[PDB]
Amino acid sequence: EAPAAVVTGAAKRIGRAIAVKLHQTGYRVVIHYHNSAEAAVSLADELNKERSNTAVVCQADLTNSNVLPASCEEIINSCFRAFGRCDVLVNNASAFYPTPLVQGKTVETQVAELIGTNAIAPFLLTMSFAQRQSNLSIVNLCDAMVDQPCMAFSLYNMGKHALVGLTQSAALELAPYGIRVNGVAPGVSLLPVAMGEEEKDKWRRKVPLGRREASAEQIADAVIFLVSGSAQYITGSIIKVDGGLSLVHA
Amino acid sequence: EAPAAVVTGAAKRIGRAIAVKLHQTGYRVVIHYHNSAEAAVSLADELNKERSNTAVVCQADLTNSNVLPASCEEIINSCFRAFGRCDVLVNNASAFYPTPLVGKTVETQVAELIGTNAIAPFLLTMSFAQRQSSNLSIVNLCDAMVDQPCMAFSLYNMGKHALVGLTQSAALELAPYGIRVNGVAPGVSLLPVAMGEEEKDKWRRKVPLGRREASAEQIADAVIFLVSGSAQYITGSIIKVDGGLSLVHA
Amino acid sequence: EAPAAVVTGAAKRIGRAIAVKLHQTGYRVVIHYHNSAEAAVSLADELNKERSNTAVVCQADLTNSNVLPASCEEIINSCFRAFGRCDVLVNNASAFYPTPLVQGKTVETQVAELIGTNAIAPFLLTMSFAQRQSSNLSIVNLCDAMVDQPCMAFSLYNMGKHALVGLTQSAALELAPYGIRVNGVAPGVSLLPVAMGEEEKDKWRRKVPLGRREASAEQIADAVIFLVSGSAQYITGSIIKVDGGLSLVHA
Amino acid sequence: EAPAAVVTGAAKRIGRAIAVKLHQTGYRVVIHYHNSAEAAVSLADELNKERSNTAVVCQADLTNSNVLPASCEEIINSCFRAFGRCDVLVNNASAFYPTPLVQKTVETQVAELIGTNAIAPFLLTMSFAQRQSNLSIVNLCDAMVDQPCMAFSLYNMGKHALVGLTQSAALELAPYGIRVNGVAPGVSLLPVAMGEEEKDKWRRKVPLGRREASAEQIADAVIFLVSGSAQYITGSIIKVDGGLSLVHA
């Protein structure tokens, strides 16, 4: 039987590259997405062409709310209904935007989205994944710059910190069940789509290793490692994939 | 005249020792509480008799919800109303209980643990900064064990990790306004009063320095230092007050 | 043409496991050793019988001294003598024993061996490896997942592993413009000491969340070969724990 | 009687401030120096004029060598000889200069950089503990230890070892009531020979006030850590960096 993996925010960019690579490794994949339906199905169709019936999509908002636990359980359920098992969970979906401390979304909504996507949804997904259960593991997409935060990203940053906490807490608690829990922490990877190249270049020039951002595939390479049998004693570890960015002083 | 401090969860144990010491140092104090009304108004009495018109209490639930931003705003407004100023914010209040991955709802457990330990601090910090020869500073009560978490305390631990992230992000963003943001990280201090001799002594025996818990007063002394004029260049620092506990391997 | 790797303290245990895996992946290897000559020659024999002229040994003391930089330079030279190139350096060799702060070997000697093998030799060897330079050059340093929760009375050993973190980070920063990656692999409990009794090993085993056992030398080698591989081309200055959760467990 | 402290490299700059401030708090002090006799003495003079026979000097090279152990034992002895007790040891002395990985002998650089920043603290720590209230050690660390200066691997290794010793010694010595802590400056007093523009470049990086810390600011955290207000604090390293270590590249 082929193992199966859930990847949140898999329609595009890093999530997509993670789904593709998992599929290429022989996983069946649930491609979860929020708004990006067209990209999600194009990915599913592309993947099913390679091997039939190996890819499904699954839509959900991962913003914090009283329906979030149910949403997260349903995501996990969808992998089971589709494939009869859930071997891997990748928590990749993430809201990201500034939330300045001082002077259109309300602050409670910014909390719900930024803390929901980056932390709470990963927690609920992790409970549901675990409640349902070999080489079982969770990979959380963290942030190598978490202790050198961007100006005015406090809620994003709090969310990523919480994710580190979850990574560790869940690694300890789920180890008796045989479920490993790890993280991949990008520094600068794929820059935002419509960011001017001149601004992209300020970021690239920061990276010691080749003055360039990570490809989504290079991020995905670390995830693959973490799910593989070459990482079977690795739990609670966060691998930075950052080109040395996090080592550079101001 | 006298500066003023807000201390959250100041009705008892460690928050109360912080409120007392701050008062003893010259501060007027807002004593925030949730459910501990009798103990709250009792401390305010004790303090005002010692220096009249230097303490009020302020009730608020710090669970996350859409109205939490207003409740936090009101806590800060309460300090200005009573004292015309707000120089010090101490984020001490905290829910703490297990939330295993495998009769409160999960939605409620997330609301309480993450709201009290993380979201409220962030919102308070925001309202504190928005309202602003001075020495303005914020002290967050963190946790020395945040990287060696209690088994099945994931939401609590996520919260405390987010508080680290807040401590750093807000230290960075508020430096240009002369507001310092730091933390104090206890290990084992006053043990939950619901706990037995064997388990209390189990915790005591782990602590290399004197095989005992920290006094509330020992925690408050580090707080007092960080708000003091001897910490004018300190921001974004978290000081463990843990007797070495965090250094001890399993 | 195959790449070549230097693995220090490679005669047995984790270093041998690293050398063997690098060899199976297609590397030619320099098996450095200090006292364990028989085991080293025996390892190179097996590897050469698998593919001729792919394995050599190279003896050196990695204790700190004024000639230690020449000793480290010769190790790297031996890889270039034997194979014409050096693509990978694994800093594995390590002295490990208690040095109580309150109270055999002189303190001087303790400092030299513990700091020398765990930090100073890795620094000097990193120096020679860089100085002596399709390609994928990296360095992997064998660290310790327990550096921040150290064993009682091991201050000099812990000092050295902390310095090795320092080197991993500093060297990753400084050598990135040359294309050389520098990372680390941090065991918790792996192969227990040969002289430790089974009862005490079981005590160590029972602390590990992931399976209540120590890591196999192979599990450690697996993460080394990941970091040297093309699957880790953007990774530098990262230290991967291979500890089964151990560093996460409170007292 | 009043307690005594040893402060290594106390003749100038951050160590002098640490010594003065300990003295003003009521400590008697040993002012260790290597090259700065004249300054060590001036300081001893100035302190003794305030309070008679409360301040002595002590010379030693803290470079790693076969004699380092005895030198460190002597430094601790001088405090017992001068005042009959030794309550505080501040490891402040430190060599600091670049040691590029690609091109003094390197092993002299190892001896100086590692000896000053890690081995001497370790030996003084041993002699301090051996020769035994509110006893504590305060090590001067570096808030930028994880974001190190380019070409300073050896210095950075030493300060990492110092973190290591801070933690190991706090653990091992807690049984004796001996607390072991660190103070980690970011940019404090800039190097005397650094260019004026170079200095302002570093100042500008600092979030809190775009200035360096004064030695006094550094010493303030030292004094806290030795005070009774830190009697449960061990194994802690307090940054005093104005948020410099938080700022991304």
Ligand SMILES: NC(=O)c1ccc[n+]([C@@H]2O[C@H](COP(=O)([O-])OP(=O)(O)OC[C@H]3O[C@@H](n4cnc5c(N)ncnc54)[C@H](OP(=O)(O)O)[C@@H]3O)[C@@H](O)[C@H]2O)c1
């Ligand atoms: N790219 C980088 O440089 C970088 C740096 C550090 C860390 N990381 C981390 O690496 C991971 C992948 O990064 P990325 O740049 O590829 O991410 P991204 O493009 O910013 O976001 C990934 C996906 O997250 C989903 N998402 C956003 N808000 C959501 C919501 N409320 N509910 C459900 N899904 C939501 C989106 O789905 P739809 O498109 O379907 O709406 C989106 O495509 C993230 O966790 C990120 O924080 C990235």
Ligand SMILES: NC(=O)c1ccc[n+]([C@@H]2O[C@H](COP(=O)([O-])OP(=O)(O)OC[C@H]3O[C@@H](n4cnc5c(N)ncnc54)[C@H](OP(=O)(O)O)[C@@H]3O)[C@@H](O)[C@H]2O)c1
């Ligand atoms: N005790 C330790 O050993 C230890 C160890 C590590 C960290 N800490 C941290 O140090 C701080 C003090 O610890 P502690 O043991 O004194 O705290 P604690 O007694 O568990 O809690 C202190 C106060 O938090 C308030 N609180 C709880 N839930 C709340 C809510 N929903 N809204 C508003 N307030 C709420 C309570 O107020 P009412 O009584 O008024 O309801 C309570 O008095 C905490 O942040 C804690 O995490 C303590």
Ligand SMILES: NC(=O)c1ccc[n+]([C@@H]2O[C@H](COP(=O)([O-])OP(=O)(O)OC[C@H]3O[C@@H](n4cnc5c(N)ncnc54)[C@H](OP(=O)(O)O)[C@@H]3O)[C@@H](O)[C@H]2O)c1
């Ligand atoms: N084993 C574990 O549980 C564990 C845990 C944490 C970290 N690690 C790290 O992983 C690495 C491998 O561990 P291990 O247990 O396999 O190592 P080990 O057996 O303790 O040491 C490996 C080799 O170190 C070499 N060595 C010792 N002193 C030397 C000196 N003065 N000069 C040159 N070489 C010297 C020895 O070579 P000869 O035999 O030829 O004399 C020895 O075979 C080490 O860096 C270790 O600290 C291991």
Ligand SMILES: NC(=O)c1ccc[n+]([C@@H]2O[C@H](COP(=O)([O-])OP(=O)(O)OC[C@H]3O[C@@H](n4cnc5c(N)ncnc54)[C@H](OP(=O)(O)O)[C@@H]3O)[C@@H](O)[C@H]2O)c1
């Ligand atoms: N200044 C900063 O911005 C900064 C930043 C981060 C960390 N720190 C740390 O804070 C501490 C104080 O800093 P600083 O700038 O005041 O230091 P510094 O002036 O570079 O050096 C302080 C003293 O250390 C002594 N020293 C140097 N080499 C020695 C040797 N081989 N043997 C014995 N003593 C020796 C010297 O004493 P003599 O003059 O008597 O020869 C020198 O005066 C240091 O540990 C430093 O690493 C400082």
Ligand SMILES: Nc1nc(N)c2c(-c3ccccc3)c[nH]c2n1
């Ligand atoms: N979800 C999400 N999307 C992102 N684009 C980022 C980035 C990032 C954004 C711009 C420059 C460097 C990094 C950093 N973290 C991110 N998280």
Ligand SMILES: Nc1nc(N)c2c(-c3ccccc3)c[nH]c2n1
């Ligand atoms: N709010 C709150 N209350 C607490 N009692 C704690 C503790 C703690 C609880 C039990 C033993 C040792 C520490 C740790 N963190 C805590 N946070």
Ligand SMILES: Nc1nc(N)c2c(-c3ccccc3)c[nH]c2n1
């Ligand atoms: N070189 C070397 N050999 C070792 N055996 C170790 C260990 C280790 C030793 C005993 C129990 C757990 C870990 C930890 N670090 C080590 N380094």
Ligand SMILES: Nc1nc(N)c2c(-c3ccccc3)c[nH]c2n1
């Ligand atoms: N002993 C010693 N002296 C120093 N001057 C330093 C510095 C430092 C030197 C220049 C700019 C910023 C920091 C950093 N660490 C230092 N240690």
